[PDB]
Amino acid sequence: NPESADLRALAKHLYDSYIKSFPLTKAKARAILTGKTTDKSPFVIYDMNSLMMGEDKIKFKHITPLQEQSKEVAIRIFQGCQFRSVEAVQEITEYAKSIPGFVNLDLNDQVTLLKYGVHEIIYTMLASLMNKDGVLISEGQGFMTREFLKSLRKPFGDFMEPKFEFAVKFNALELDDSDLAIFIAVIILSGDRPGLLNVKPIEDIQDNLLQALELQLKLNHPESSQLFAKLLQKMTDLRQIVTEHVQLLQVIKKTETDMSLHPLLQEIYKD
Ligand SMILES: CCCCCN1C(=O)C(=O)c2cc(SCCc3ccc(C(=O)O)cc3)ccc21
Ligand SMILES: [Cl-]
């Protein structure tokens, strides 16, 4: 069909830019997590002992020097959790520029779409690095168990749990990276974001993106019926984790007044 080819060439385009923008794809994460072993076998951190024992191999050097070794383990892990967020935002930003028409919208809308969109995308991509037992870290060289993160000092202990809760339900849909590329594009171009000056051009692109996603899911998963509707229904789960993420940030801000934030997050954190 002549009109379907525009959507599939659009899917091929977003898939191509997805691979170019994100080094940690779901396919590589799944290769490490299944028992294909030898070279890509990760080191596992399950308790405070293995953590110090793995700092030789875990590359825990990416912790901010101003607020690094002096702080307790619970704050440091939170610091590394936020350091993987600046990297995702940078990559989502580079990814957003490749979505056709995005760079042609108003600048203020572009900043608005990224300010509210990156967090919903982060937890979507974080699910690719997760199973029921833990999450990949250090570019797949490490694996931090869900049990150990859950055991951290409060409220940092119950901060990774809602992401693990979302990952197990989201990973049940069995989407690959070709589907996630289009879905991530749909999340960016939401016309219902607060402060959008011109909403109509944003909705026009998301129509085209949703058309591409529905056709992509029908061809890549022909046996899974209503995968389109069930995938769109899981953003209600994505806005909830976001809303409790903003709730523990203001708690940490007044509990840990001596803790810095990366300027990219401090600007995103304004709601
Ligand atoms: C994939 C898209 C962006 C994800 C951003 N991101 C979160 O938002 C989040 O909550 C979270 C939680 C962890 S787990 C504990 C933190 C941690 C991080 C890195 C290392 C390391 O040494 O590599 C060690 C520990 C990791 C990444 C996270
Ligand atoms: Cl990252």
From Swiss-Prot:
What does the entry report about post-translational modification of this chain?
A: Phosphorylated in basal conditions and dephosphorylated when treated with the ligand. May be dephosphorylated by PPP5C.
One GO cellular-component annotation of the UniProt record comes to: cytosol
Motif window: 9aaTAD: 263-271
Q: For the region Interaction with FAM120B, what residue ranges are annotated?
A: 1-48
Any single GO molecular-function term of the entry would be: DNA-binding transcription factor activity
Q: What induces it?
A: (Microbial infection) Expression increases when incubated with M.tuberculosis or its lipoprotein LpqH; induction is TLR2-dependent (at protein level).
Q: How is its activity regulated?
A: PDPK1 activates its transcriptional activity independently of its kinase activity.
Residues in NR LBD domain copies: 6-271
Provide the GO biological process annotations.
BMP signaling pathway; cell differentiation; cell fate commitment; cell maturation; cellular response to hypoxia; cellular response to insulin stimulus; cellular response to low-density lipoprotein particle stimulus; epithelial cell differentiation
Q: Where does rosiglitazone bind?
A: 82-85, 119, 245, 269
Tissues expressed in: Highest expression in adipose tissue. Lower in skeletal muscle, spleen, heart and liver. Also detectable in placenta, lung and ovary.
Q: Glycyl lysine isopeptide (Lys-Gly) (interchain with G-Cter in ubiquitin) cross-link located where? A: 20
Its family remark reads: Belongs to the nuclear hormone receptor family. NR1 subfamily.
Q: Which disease is it linked to?
A: Defects in PPARG can lead to type 2 insulin-resistant diabetes and hyptertension. PPARG mutations may be associated with colon cancer. Obesity: A condition characterized by an increase of body weight beyond the limitation of skeletal and physical requirements, as the result of excessive accumulation of body fat.
Domain comment quoted from the record: The 9aaTAD motif is a transactivation domain present in a large number of yeast and animal transcription factors.
Q: What does this protein do?
A: Nuclear receptor that binds peroxisome proliferators such as hypolipidemic drugs and fatty acids. Once activated by a ligand, the nuclear receptor binds to DNA specific PPAR response elements (PPRE) and modulates the transcription of its target genes, such as acyl-CoA oxidase. It therefore controls the peroxisomal beta-oxidation pathway of fatty acids. Key regulator of adipocyte differentiation and glucose homeostasis. ARF6 acts as a key regulator of the tissue-specific adipocyte P2 (aP2) enhancer.
Q: Subunit composition?
A: Interacts with FOXO1 (acetylated form). Heterodimer with other nuclear receptors, such as RXRA. The heterodimer with the retinoic acid receptor RXRA is called adipocyte-specific transcription factor ARF6. Interacts with NCOA6 coactivator, leading to a strong increase in transcription of target genes. Interacts with coactivator PPARBP, leading to a mild increase in transcription of target genes. Interacts with NOCA7 in a ligand-inducible manner. Interacts with NCOA1 and NCOA2 LXXLL motifs. Interacts with ASXL1, ASXL2, DNTTIP2, FAM120B, MAP2K1/MEK1, NR0B2, PDPK1, PRDM16, PRMT2 and TGFB1I1.
Q: What is this protein called?
A: Peroxisome proliferator-activated receptor gamma
Gene source species: Homo sapiens
Upper classification of the organism:
Eukaryota, Metazoa, Chordata, Craniata, Vertebrata
